Amino acid sequence: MEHSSLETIELFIQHLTEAMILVNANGFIRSCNQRSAELLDCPQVSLKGQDWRNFLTEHHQARYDNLLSHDGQPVQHPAQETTLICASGKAKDVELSISYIPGHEPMFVMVMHDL
């Protein structure tokens, strides 16, 4: 899985009726879908490039200081209650899961289920 696989995955996510974003090791959004744009209340063009930590509450923010080192190992966990914060200040309670995809350019996949 390299730069070519990335495109494949990015396109794949576009078809999914699940809200999800692709994030790099530094925590910045590399790719997303229309569902995540609606959930996070932000257009895809403006969503990519953003630090995903921008949508987390201050508490959960510290929870994800570094994606490559858990609160020593790269973070990943099945869905769990999390509160998201939109630029408008609107807070949505969701179920967040994080997946880790190792590689020279490690990616993290966030699937957020709106509650």
Add this chain to the structure above:
Amino acid sequence: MEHSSLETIELFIQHLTEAMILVNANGFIRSCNQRSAELLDCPQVSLKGQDWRNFLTEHHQARYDNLLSQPVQHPAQETTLICASGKAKDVELSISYIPGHEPMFVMVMHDL
């Protein structure tokens, strides 16, 4: 998508901590991940190849009998599944349609 991409997507699915399966137009599981095997009480190696209808309630939505016939697709909605163990489990199932000469369908199951 093309066969070439199938490998990539499949490997991608196997890494996620969300239960999801990739099924073909005929309704047969083409790919799955350990999370789905856990949720469905079925060994991962046995999931592939089955008719996904085997995990649906007897009197299920007729729509699920023909995915390609607009094709079946919808966000996560409450659904009761029957695990291989025979036990029922309420989940929020979402179905996504992937166009192509060989159309695919991907299901994501969230266990409440």
